[PDB]
């Protein structure tokens, strides 16, 4: 009925605000990106610092893992993405084409494509093997805040400050669905549900919404947290109870019951906006990370 997440570790090392944290698909690692231009890798279970990956010329807004846990991609203010060999820390490829900050990135499940979103209002799709841009989508009329592939990589969902969430056919680059709200708040984050049937979209009016995008139907609204300013990550937690997990501008991590929408836990400890949270693929572990007053990542563990 309610989880009992407790703080296990606080991970310090970044020298500016942290921007995103992501667990490796194999569950061994956490990767973090920062405005400090660095990616850092941490042990998921003991919180032990592992290595720093460097090479971007400006801050990084996002990082994402390949399905084999062997590669990372990062999205930077320097207008590029970089693909990294996790093992060696070496930059394999630099993906060039965006004309403004790259804000968000993700690999497909097959890990042969990367999708990116940028302040240049486009979504791009890249070949992992060659580093070539395969498609540029004129996706939105304002910065693209999030991009995510579904369970088999056949669709991309994008979100933007323009107030829209769009679903795209990966192979053709065609927009299959636009979700709209008559009051048109900026959409600050989106991702598919693990089963691929739903999208979870954050808007800058302190709400998260679960949509059946095929039917154009909003099914659940999660409220009570603070989110009017930043592009904060949200998550489905499915290892124990079925929850929704998000950061918040009141410095807390919020956890809701997915079905009932009840807040079941708030995690206190950070001293700035919790910009990013991530859920461990197999264990009931959450990672959270915070902005400039804080600069730390925390690891939390629950029995359910």
């Amino acid at each position: 009925v309610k989880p009992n997440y407790a703080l296990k570790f606080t991970l310090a090392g970044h020298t500016k605000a942290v921007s995103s944290v992501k667990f490796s698909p194999n569950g061994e690692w956490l990767a973090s990106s920062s405005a400090d231009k660095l990616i850092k890798i941490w042990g998921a279970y003991d919180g032990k610092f592992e290595k720093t990956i460097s090479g971007h010329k400006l801050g990084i807004s996002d990082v994402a893992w390949s399905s084999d846990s062997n590669l990372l991609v990062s999205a930077s203010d320097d207008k590029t993405l970089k693909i990294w060999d996790v093992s060696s820390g070496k930059c394999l490829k630099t993906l060039k084409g965006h004309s403004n900050y790259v804000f968000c990135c993700n690999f497909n499940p097959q890990s042969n494509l990367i999708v990116s979103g940028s302040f240049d209002e486009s979504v791009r799709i890249w070949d992992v093997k060659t580093g070539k841009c395969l498609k540029t989508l004129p996706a939105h009329s304002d910065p693209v805040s999030a991009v995510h592939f579904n369970r088999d990589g056949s669709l991309i969902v994008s979100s933007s400050y323009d107030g829209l969430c769009r679903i795209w056919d990966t192979a053709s680059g065609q927009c299959l669905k636009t979700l709209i709200d008559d009051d048109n708040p900026p959409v600050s984050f989106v991702k598919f549900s693990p089963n691929g049937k739903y999208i979870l979209a954050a808007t800058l009016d302190n709400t998260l919404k679960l949509w059946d995008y095929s039917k154009g139907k909003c099914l659940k609204t999660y409220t009570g947290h603070k989110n009017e300013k930043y592009c904060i990550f949200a998550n489905f937690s499915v290892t124990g109870g079925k929850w929704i997990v998000s950061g918040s501008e009141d410095n807390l991590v919020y956890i809701w019951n997915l079905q009932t929408k009840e807040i079941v836990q708030k995690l206190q400890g950070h001293t700035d906006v919790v910009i990013s949270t991530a859920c461990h693929p197999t264990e009931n572990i959450i990672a959270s990370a915070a902005l400039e007053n804080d600069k730390t990542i925390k690891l939390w563990k629950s029995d359910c």
Partner: peptide, 7 residues
């Protein structure tokens, strides 16, 4: 960009 307010 993510760590500042741009909206």
């Amino acid at each position: 960009a993510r760590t500042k307010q741009t909206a």
